[PDB]
Amino acid sequence: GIDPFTAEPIQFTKRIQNIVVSEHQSATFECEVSFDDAIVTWYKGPTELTESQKYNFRNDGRCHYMTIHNVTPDDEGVYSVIARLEPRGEARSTAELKGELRSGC
């Protein structure tokens, strides 16, 4: 009749948003999800992001954080977060990265 709530599709309530970051600073895309058992991977363009003393991935219950250190104009682009669990209805979200210009006199 009606599918169970637990198997219902997973979506990001917070829905990451666009970030503007100074060249020497760091960018963080924060997301929140319906289930805490979901597995999340961040994507930049066709390339997936992995740790290399470059990307810091921190998990906190339903909350998942990704921090990028040393952002370049080149690095500006689109970042996505995808949450996956056994077939329940996967979700995809996007956000844009922008490089803030350094201030001066």
Curated annotation (Swiss-Prot):
Assembly mode: Interacts with MYOM1, MYOM2, tropomyosin and myosin. Interacts with actin, primarily via the PEVK domains and with MYPN. Interacts with FHL2, NEB, CRYAB, LMNA/lamin-A and LMNB/lamin-B. Interacts with TCAP/telethonin and/or ANK1 isoform Mu17/ank1.5, via the first two N-terminal immunoglobulin domains. Interacts with TRIM63, TRIM55, ANKRD1, ANKRD2, ANKRD23, and CAPN3 through several Ig domains. Interacts with NBR1 through the protein kinase domain. Interacts with CMYA5.
Domain characteristics, as noted in the entry: ZIS1 and ZIS5 regions contain multiple SPXR consensus sites for ERK- and CDK-like protein kinases as well as multiple SP motifs. ZIS1 could adopt a closed conformation which would block the TCAP-binding site.
Residues annotated as domain Ig-like: 9-97
Name used for this protein in its record: Titin
Superkingdom of source: Eukaryota
Species annotation: Mus musculus
Lineage: Eukaryota, Metazoa, Chordata, Craniata, Vertebrata
Residues of the full protein shown: 9719 to 9809 of 35213
Transmembrane segments: none
Compartments, as annotated in UniProt: Cytoplasm; Nucleus
Free-text description of this protein's post-translational modifications in UniProt: Autophosphorylated.
Function: Key component in the assembly and functioning of vertebrate striated muscles. By providing connections at the level of individual microfilaments, it contributes to the fine balance of forces between the two halves of the sarcomere. The size and extensibility of the cross-links are the main determinants of sarcomere extensibility properties of muscle. In non-muscle cells, seems to play a role in chromosome condensation and chromosome segregation during mitosis. Might link the lamina network to chromatin or nuclear actin, or both during interphase.
Family per record: Belongs to the protein kinase superfamily. CAMK Ser/Thr protein kinase family.
